Amino acid sequence: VQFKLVLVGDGGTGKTTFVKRHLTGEFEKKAVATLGVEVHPLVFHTNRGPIKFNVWDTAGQEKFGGLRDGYYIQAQCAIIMFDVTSRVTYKNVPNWHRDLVRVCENIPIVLCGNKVDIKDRKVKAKSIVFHRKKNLQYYDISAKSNYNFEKPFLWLARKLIGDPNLEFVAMPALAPPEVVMDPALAAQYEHDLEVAQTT
Ligand SMILES: Nc1nc2c(ncn2[C@@H]2O[C@H](COP(=O)(O)OP(=O)(O)O)[C@@H](O)[C@H]2O)c(=O)[nH]1
Ligand SMILES: [Mg+2]
Numbered sequence: 001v002q003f004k005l006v007l008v009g010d011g012g013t014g015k016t017t018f019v020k021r022h023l024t025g026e027f028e029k030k031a032v033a034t035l036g037v038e039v040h041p042l043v044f045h046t047n048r049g050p051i052k053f054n055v056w057d058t059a060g061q062e063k064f065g066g067l068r069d070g071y072y073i074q075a076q077c078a079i080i081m082f083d084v085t086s087r088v089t090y091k092n093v094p095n096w097h098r099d100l101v102r103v104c105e106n107i108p109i110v111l112c113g114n115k116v117d118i119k120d121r122k123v124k125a126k127s128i129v130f131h132r133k134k135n136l137q138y139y140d141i142s143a144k145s146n147y148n149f150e151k152p153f154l155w156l157a158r159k160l161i162g163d164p165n166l167e168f169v170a171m172p173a174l175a176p177p178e179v180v181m182d183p184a185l186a187a188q189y190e191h192d193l194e195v196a197q198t199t
Contacts, residue, residue: 002052003160005042006072006104008096009081010089011063014114018081018143019057023173035070036061044153045170051157053077072103077156084113084123084140093130108159110137110152116189117142117179125192140189145181146174 007015020026025040032039036059043052056075061067080096082089093111100109111131113123131138139151150168158166 002041002054003076003156004074005053005055005156006075006078006100007055007057007081008062008067008078008100010083010086010092010096011060012086013081013083013089014143015081016057018112018114018141018149019055021143021146021149021174023175025055025172026175032056035068037071042153042172044150044157044168044172046157046161046166047169048161048163048166051161053153053156066099069103072100075100075104075107077107077160078104078109079112079152079156080109080136081112081114082123083115084121085115085118087122090123090128090130097130097134108156109134110139110155112139112141112152114141114143116140116147116186117145117181125189125196128193128196138193140193142179142181144179145177147181147186149174 007019009015019040022040022042025042029038029040037056040055040057041052042055043050056071058067078100080093080100082093113128128138137155139148141148150171154168158164
């Protein structure tokens with residue numbers, strides 16, 4: 001079965017673009033009009049069987065402050081997103097994490113810095129520290145290129161199932177890349193996180 005996943009972060013960070021990479025989850029999405037949400041059934045296939053993350057994507061109301069309690073309620077996991085080309089989105093991560101945990105106190109949470117395909121990166125590995133204090137997991141991602149798409153969900157699945165050896169045995173069908181994520185740049189970004197991490 002299944003887990004409610006809430007996807008939060010400033011307007012314009014690429015939450016909608018992200019959740020939409022998973023093609024069947026977009027085709028089978030369900031409206032929850034009473035809370036201004038579209039729930040996308042993101043199925044992933046593990047060595048322990050199938051897991052379904054029901055990802056709750058807003059209809060843009062985060063542009064105007066915290067979300068309603070009904071949005072967060074009964075969430076079993078979360079992704080907090082920021083835009084690595086917009087420093088204020090990173091600065092707002094504490095506010096999202098507070099908005100989130102007030103309603104969902106013991107859930108696994110991953111932090112994702114999106115748009116790493118844009119050449120002029122502002123929030124670099126050296127400054128990404130918020131996950132460390134809260135012992136949350138961080139990934140760089142690029143929704144438009146599918147780069148690291150599966151990472152946040154694999155880390156959440158390991159935490160929810162309590163199996164640090166879980167693996168995905170097949171990739172979901174994803175929208176074809178709309179930008180190129182340069183493999184050398186990606187490698188260097190992962191390296192920089194590793195090097196920031198040993199500090
Ligand atoms: N370059 C780049 N642009 C992105 C990416 N994800 C989203 N965008 C752009 O960011 C803008 C806001 O994306 P949206 O998904 O609507 O963000 P939301 O408001 O957080 O749901 C749109 O112009 C997107 O096309 C990405 O990975 N790379
Ligand atoms: Mg959106």
